[model samples]
Target: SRRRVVITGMGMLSPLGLDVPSSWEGILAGRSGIAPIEHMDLSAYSTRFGGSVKGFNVEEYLSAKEARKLDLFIQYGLAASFQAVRDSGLEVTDANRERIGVSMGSGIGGLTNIENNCRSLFEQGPRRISPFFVPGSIINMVSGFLSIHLGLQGPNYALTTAQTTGTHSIGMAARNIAYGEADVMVAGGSEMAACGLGLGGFGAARALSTRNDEPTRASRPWDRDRDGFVLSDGSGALVLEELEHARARGARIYAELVGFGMSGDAFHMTAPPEDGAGAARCMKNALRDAGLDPRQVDYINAHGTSTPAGDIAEIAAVKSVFGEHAHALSMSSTKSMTGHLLGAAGAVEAIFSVLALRDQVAPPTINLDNPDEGCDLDLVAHEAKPRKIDVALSNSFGFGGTNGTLVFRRFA
Candidate 1:
């Protein structure tokens, strides 16, 4: 039998709050985090609103000089990782240093930094570029920096699969622990893509919501009124440990991470097939790995990004996989509140799932006044639902038809 893995700590930065408890509180209250984009002029953009992290002081986590050198994504990742480390009560010493690792990711890394440097190169030449540009902007820099910051000397890497990045990161980290390669792994993802190029490119792709006037109600997953997904930025991280190792240290276990699954659509660059066969397979795979019957799942944190096709497709996928149980289980989209946090979506939603198991309540999918055709599942709409949540699942589907699912069960 494979070794078991459990989540001992979780941390997140979202449009709703700066940390886990505050964010979860807002989520349970069905508050909207989507609002007008700040820090940039948006007069020329089609989508002018987003879910940006507010009032986060990076200097609190890093020196002002050090924070200034990195992109917002890296800063967010490092900050969240620091929070998880502290929450886990893990002390890094020579004895256990070699057994700890990191896996952090981002979908579109350093877009703002890239845009700024491109402007500098065009106006003042390459010689004027900052020395920290490459190190600060690359996708793997989060894992590298986090590892260096905490002196974690094992299995340091990052995985980028668009929105599935965070799920894959945590899943892979759990594998490292389960396989005896590491005792503990700091894993998750972050993103800060509400910048100009990110907003413009996604807007041009017709992938963002244009509900500029009603920003707060824009990201209505499964709602008939949803135009598109709301762009956002944030981070989510977790500390995964071998069960025995965690027990030996007397660490508080949030939940047991029983299974993770990944799959590819191989059908479209940014769209799922109408039947959602790929996503159905992904959920089935996760259930199989978890040794769970479809009826056993109590809640699902859906990849319900509020885009028309994506939302409906996910519903179809769930029905196909869960059948009658689809109607019995409660499902919700935290994206409806946090907007789409892109690469960080999976990690944050996974954290939300763990919390649902912890609190025995399903979070809400706000603004779902009317469910679209085929979205008739028990969507826990408009308000949080208190229930006997023992097993919770989280699903994340990214661009390029990539998919991932995580299954977490209450730790007995």
Candidate 2:
């Protein structure tokens, strides 16, 4: 039998809050983190508001020199990874240092840093670029920096799969443990894409909500008034350990990561088929990996990103996968409150799913007042509700038609 992997610790930095507990409070209260974007000038863009991280004092996590040398995305990733490692209480000694690894990445890495350096390149000269430019913005810098700082010597890498970065990282990390490659893995994703070129590029693609007057209500997944996703900045990390190893260490277990699934739509560049065929197959694949029946799932942290087509497509996928159980299951888009964190969405949502299993409560999908057609599932809307959540699944479908699903079960 394959080795079992369990989540021993978790951390997150999101527009909702800087840590897991704080963000969970915001989600449980149905609070929206969406607000006006202030870091950049949005006068020329169609979308003015986004979910930006607030009150993050980087000095608390990194020294001034270190902070200056890294981009915001790397900073966010390192902070969250530190939190997860601390929470896991794993000691990196001479013997076990090589048994731990890091797998973290971003959908879009260091947009603000890239934009600034490019401006410097054009305005001044090639010599004007900072020496830290390359290391600061690269996708693998999180894994590199984390492994360096933490003294981990095992498999160290990052995966850049657009928004599926986190899910893929976490899933592959668990597989590493299961395959005897490592005993522990720190895995997740981070993104700081609310900068000039980042915001302008997404806005130009018409993939953002234009409800400039009502930022808080802009990310209305499954609602009739839904426009598009709200770009957000965030990071999420989890420490996955082999089950016996965790028990030997007396580690606190959140939940058992039972299954992981991935798929390619082979359909569109930025959109999914209306029927959600690929998504259905992804869900089924996860269930099969978990050795589970469709009815065994109690809740789903949907990838309902408030985009019109994406929202309906997810609904159709759930119905086709679960059939009658679709109406019986409680599925909520935490993105409704946290906004779309892109690469960080999956790990953050996976954390929320584990919390749901822990607390037996389903976070609400706020601003879901008028459900659109095909939104027939029992989407816990407006208010958090208590439920008997034994098994929960989190879904993330990203750009380039990439899809990932993770299944977690309440620890026995």
Candidate 3:
């Protein structure tokens, strides 16, 4: 028999807001978080806008020395993880320290740092690069910093699966607890890829939206006028505990992690499978893992990145997985508001999905004025809606053809 897992606390640092409450409020109010890039100079770039998390004070979260030692992506992850640990109300002492773990992920870890250090090595010489450059640029350091800060002495690791990285981290963390490897796990994803190289690389690949003038409407998921995904930066973290452990400690449960599924589209490296067959299988596998029928699902937070092929294929996958229930499910792409956070997107969207289940209100898919006919569904468009959500699904498909899905059930 497998142990049960439940979410006790959640934290977010996104373009929408700095914390979970503010971000959720913004999403529920149908406000867009996408805006012009103000954090860095965009004068040289073609796509000059993104879903940037503005007004975040790094000094407020970390000391000067510590902040300088870590990359922006790792800093975001550490900040969000601190918030999550504080919110979880779990005091890690000598008693349970070994039972707690950290599992975080980042798709393109420390791209900004890598770019800067590489330039320094080339132009100024290797002596000019800081000693902290290697540790700051690596992907695993997100978990490393979080584990050290929280004193979580159990299994600590990070995943780098592009967009699916976050969902995969959560799933694997839950599985670790389910199989008795740990009693508590802090898991999620983070990304800070709004820098020059981050934007230039994606732009070079033609994967970013070019709606520089209308930044707010740039990430119009499932809309006919959608061009491409708007790049964003942020982090999200969740505290997952074994059911018995949470019950013993009288922890407040947010939702049960009922199911998780993952797949790969071997057909393409960047593009999704032509018919989204792998994505459909991923959703179906999650439903099967939960031992629930598709009809039981009330909402779906889609991996709708506002691109033409991605949106259409995702809708097709949903229809194939849910069949008739697909029309009935209240589906929305929070990315329509937060833009694409890349690796961190799945974790942030998962938090949003769990919040929707807890609040019984589905977040809206904003900027759907021109809907794509082929991608029609109950997209909770333009405005938020009140609904009794019992079970919800969140989907994330990465650039390397990785697909991840998670199912959460409201706790009665």
Candidate 4:
């Protein structure tokens, strides 16, 4: 039999809040993290706003020397991982160090660092670039730095699959333990592309909202007035351990990560399939992997990025998977509060999903006064609602038509 894997600890660095407790509080309160751009000068950009993590002092989490060597994305990962490791209370002694592993993901790794370094090399010279440029810019270094910081000797890796990056990372980590490759794994995703080139690049692709004046209402998922997704950045980390291992260590188990599914649209690189076939397949596969029927799913942490096409198609995909039971499930896009964290979105939303199951309170999809005609479902709009959630599914679809779904069950 496969080993059972459960989430023992988690951490988050998002626009909503810095740590898990505060972020969960904000989500329960139905708060919005989207606001004016405070990190960089946004005057010249088409989309001058985003859901930026407020007052994140990297030096508070890492030494100045250490923080300088990593890009903002990696820095966020390091900080969140620190919290996750501390919260998990797993003793990483010399005896068990090699048994622990790290698996983190970032969709677009170190874009700010790469952009700045290239600018320096062109204007000044190769010698002008910092020695830390290469190491700081690679995506895999997220897991590398984490392993070094925590002394984790087992498989250290990262995945970059656009928005599905986080879900894939967690699912892969669970698979490692189920297959007896590792006993414990620290897994999640981080992204910090809310910089000049980051926003400019997505804007050029016409993939972001232009609601600069009303940033809080920018990410209105399933709303007819929605323009596009609001680009944001942050990191989220979760500690996954074999169920028996956690029980032996007296660790508090949050939820059991029982199922994971991934699929590709085979259509446009940026757009989802019109019929939502790929997304439906991803959710169906997850249910099957969990040995669950469609009706068993009680909540869905939607991948609705508030984009016109993406939101409607995702709702349609839910209907495809749930069929008659679609009406019985509660669904909401926490992106309505955190905006779109892109590569880190799935991990952060997964955190929210776990909290929903634990607290029996589902976060709301704010700014849904004008619902799209095609998006006809209970979106749990305007305010948080209390529900007895048992099995929850989180969906993440990204660029290149990649889709990932994870099913988590409340642990007794």
lDDT of 4 by residue, 1-412 (tens): 7999999989889998988889888888888989888757778888998888888888877889988899999988877888888888999989988889999889998988988898999999999999999998899988998898878999889999998999999988999998889999999999999877889999998889999889999999998899999988889999999999999989999999999999888879899987789999999989898999999999999998998889988988999889898978999999998988888898888889998999988789999988888677889989998998999999999889999999999999
Cα error, residue 370 of model 1, in Å, equals 1.1
- Clash pairs for candidate 1: none
> Which candidate do you rate higher for TM-score, 2 or 3?
2
- lDDT digits (tens) for residues 1-412 of candidate 1: 7899999999899999999999999999999988898779999999999999999999889999999889999999998899999999999999999999999999999999999999999999999899999998998988898888889998999999998999989998998998899999999999999888999999999999999999999999999999999998999999999999999999999999998888998989998888888899998999998899988999999999998888988898989998888898999999999999999999889899999999999999999999988788999999999999989999998889999999999998
State the weakest 10-residue window (summed lDDT) of model 3: 35-44
TM-scores for all candidates: the values are 0.99, 0.99, 0.98, 0.98
* lDDT on C-alpha atoms for all candidate structures: 0.93, 0.92, 0.90, 0.90
- Number of backbone clashes in candidate 4: 0
| lDDT value, residue 401 of candidate 4 | 92
Report how far residue 343 has shifted in candidate 3, in Å: 0.7
Better of 1 and 3 by TM-score: 1
Instruction: Tell me the RMSD of model 3 versus the true structure.
Output: 1.1
